[PDB]
Symmetry: C3
Subunit: 387 residues, 3 copies
């Protein structure tokens, strides 16, 4: 009996309304402090004498024996500057089995800067073969390195300092104009800045997200960082803007070694994010599929009234004639803009290209100190005597 029609409604077409996400792109003004170079110059030099003063009066004599030890003569600051420029180190006179009056060498002052060499290793000797006499052996080791080492910049009470990174995780703040010099046992160290700190007014792009877990993430060239306060530093750069740990002490992270396990952990976060993006790209593709179905239906409706529409859409010189709901034949027979879309420019991702520096202990300058220690152990392992 469906000669009669029924009526329901009224209805309305739903608009699409996504939950808003607040993160947005800011362009922050900042004063940026950077350096004209990315390395400090570490000059490290060492010098040690082995001094063995022995008396041989036979085993009955309680004075028979040896006073044999290492004595450190670390270079002074002036010496180290000359060692660095000449790539050579200096050492004292060698005494080989000196007895009698010649044995005084082991008792008097030692002049540690009488002979030069690029490197010098000592021989450990404590011979005592001359009965009723003292016997003296002296020999020297020395060496020097001049090596570039990376560094950080750092705010220290409202001024930008160079932060020299030490292999034990401590740091020493200083101005780019004041070299560091210190002595420790056999070694002296000179850290020099052959660069200056330049300041610039810059604009930094950041994404501020008030809905963490309030949090700003920024990019400056190949450097990426989370800005946590208005005075901020990252590696070689400090900024002023406008408007896990305790297993390692408070050691700088530049001396803590990453594990493969840490890389796996970072990799799995990447994997999760990329797969989510994959799922979201699938939904975006689905929306364009849906919009093409809606549009094709809408166009089919208007095109039956306006026989030029299809031709204008494909830029073909044809008018159309429909033979069904969807099938059609084709025959060949300056103003003011109004934006109805109001689209905002997309931010595009790009390859990050982060520079990596490695641990401070990996640097040649600092591993030179470890190599010096290892070589002393080898040469000291046993006496080179007739003893």
């Amino acid at each position: 009996d469906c000669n009669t029609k029924t009526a329901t409604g009224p209805y309305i077409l739903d608009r699409y309304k996504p939950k808003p996400v607040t993160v947005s792109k800011k362009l922050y003004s900042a004063t940026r402090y950077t350096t004209s170079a990315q390395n400090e110059l570490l000059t490290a030099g060492y010098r040690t004498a082995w001094v063995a003063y022995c008396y041989n009066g036979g085993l009955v004599d309680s004075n028979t024996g040896c006073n044999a030890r290492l004595l450190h003569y670390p270079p002074s600051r002036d010496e180290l500057l000359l060692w660095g420029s000449s790539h050579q180190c200096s050492y004292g006179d060698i005494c080989h089995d000196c007895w009698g009056s010649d044995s005084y060498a082991c008792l008097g002052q030692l002049d540690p800067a009488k002979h030069w060499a690029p490197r010098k290793e000592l021989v450990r000797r404590d011979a005592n073969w001359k009965f009723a006499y003292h016997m003296c052996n002296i020999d020297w080791r020395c060496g020097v390195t001049t090596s570039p080492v990376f560094f950080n910049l750092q705010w220290v009470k409202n001024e930008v300092k160079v932060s020299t990174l030490l292999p034990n995780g401590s740091t020493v703040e200083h101005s780019a104009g004041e070299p560091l010099f210190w002595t420790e046992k056999d070694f002296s160290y000179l850290v020099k800045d052959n660069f200056e700190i330049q300041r610039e007014e810059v604009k930094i792009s950041c994404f501020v997200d008030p809905d963490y877990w309030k949090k700003a993430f920024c990019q400056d060239g190949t450097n990426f960082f989370e800005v946590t306060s208005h005075q901020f530093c990252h590696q070689y750069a400090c900024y002023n803007f406008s408007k896990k740990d305790l297993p390692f002490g408070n050691k700088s992270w530049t001396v803590v070694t990453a594990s493969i396990d840490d890389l796996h952990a970072l990799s799995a976060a990447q994997a999760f994010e990329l797969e989510g993006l994959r799922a979201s790209f699938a939904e975006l593709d689905s929306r364009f599929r849906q919009l093409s179905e809606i549009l094709d239906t809408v166009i089919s409706s208007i095109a039956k009234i306006d026989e030029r529409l299809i031709g204008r859409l494909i830029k073909a010189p044809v008018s159309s004639r429909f033979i069904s709901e969807d099938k059609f034949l084709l025959h060949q027979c300056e103003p003011i803009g109004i934006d109805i879309y109001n689209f905002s420019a997309l931010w595009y991702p790009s390859a990050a290209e982060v520079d990596f520096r490695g641990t401070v202990q990996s640097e040649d300058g600092w591993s030179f100190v470890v190599k010096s220690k290892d070589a002393l152990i080898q040469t000291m392992m046993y006496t080179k005597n007739g003893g």
Copy 2:
């Protein structure tokens, strides 16, 4: 003369079958991030000599290091007090004093925060024995990170050793062992918590790889689920019944990552970001194309419906076209139907993962290496002057 029939093609993307899930699971976590490692060492240098002149075959020295690693009860006391104990020192003790180098030594007669020995083997008293004894000792109490691990069907604490081995135990049972000069105590000042949770994962049913993969997030932890019973660092998971030889079997927590490995990971990131850039450019091109289609479409209907352009710009205007594109403007509870059927987009977000470092980098374990290096330096030569 006409051609056709034609039909408007619809856009048909190849389907991509990765989907978001909400999995139910039991999650085992712990109060604290760290175990407590107490490590203490103690060694005596003992040099027992006889000087009968070189004609006597008994002239010479029995000089050596002897280890007295602290017992469990001692290590507990060294831990709480931050001091170590050591025995009597003998400096050139001859005659009746030289017998201190014989028999049993009492290694716990004095206390110090730390103590290093001096190596001496003097023998200068003709016709007498001569005895030198000195001691080294030290203690550290250091937090060290751990993993949880399924053993049989229970969740154990996995203590990580610097050589890449691991020891599984309950959180309640401390580890204690002794090795040469050192004794080691691992205590857990925490308990394992049980909680029912829902974990968001993306399951990709066709993942290739030359051939079914699930990637999950739990807060700041991300992992690939590879079984129903699963652990990732400080947490173990039990999921419902739905859904390198160069290093030996070493725990990856002791293997150092190289800069080369970081470059490999960075290059992966760079490729994916550039592909995302290419895809964003295609997405922008599609919105460009849609705005051209819609403008042509609207311009056709707006000639029929002189109010339409007004509704599109929220204005009370009427329109009159003077050409195909150019126009003038004259001034002047329902049931929802959803024709779009859009699904919520998943949004990414900064994934701030915590890094732990190699076991060997931790202060607790490098204390062992530093004690070894310090003994080499003090033993380098005899102090007989």
Copy 3:
């Protein structure tokens, strides 16, 4: 409604015109060279003798004393081969306090291959307790490892070589059939390739970005390996590539990056870059959802205008046999109850999206972390422990 008389225009509907971004996807043809396996075989062996030849003539005699020293006898290549297969090392005769005529063993050439053991550590002894006689002490250490070590491939003068990675950051390039053998102090080393380099013609997906500057870049994927192509002749880890060309650090002193340890600081910096990009993708996704929101508003208003004329349109959009009747601007009622296929016309001309995917990059660790090379350091450390003091107790005729 309306007062025609005056205003305004003419106006035109703006089209959306995005700034063009010029990174494009390529399939590059290349010759790829890979290997059957991902490890070389490092055989490393050491052997040393402690030899102490002493004379006791009392302290008045200037020849009283010792010639006590370590003497290295690194295995020959043939020895090393036998050590690796047997998993044993050889060493010479040992002498404990051999005095008088037996001290003869400390003189002349020592034969270092008389005994066998899986491993052997020496005792350091230089006793001299036999007055008016010589005394001889000899002992030996030896050890061997056979371990897999990872390697790179590398182009050397237009051929693919295997690149053996040494723990000091240098590398040795050689053909896969040329084993490496060298001797250094107490150690000899044999590096053997039990694999072949295989050639293959491939197509490689790359994204090429001609607008890539800092102050012309190509990023490729091949399986789980990702690399930036910097030249037509190019290697990445275990693979070398030759791309058709008509189609396209001071603190470490030039060491291979495979020996430079990554810091936690380095990881944080990469992590920070990931975070910035992901929050950018978040913001960009928000703009995408905004655009769909906006399109749904435009389409709804457009459909509302056409549907008043075409009462079947809405029924077709929801796939239902209904005609509509508008009762206001937005509100409407619904009333109910060969031969050739059509030629498709594509007005959209969308290109297929590239979809991201989890990258499962393999990590290799530092060379020094490998068991084969850490064996050398352990050998050195063990020698230091054994040599730390002489074990001269305690005998006498």
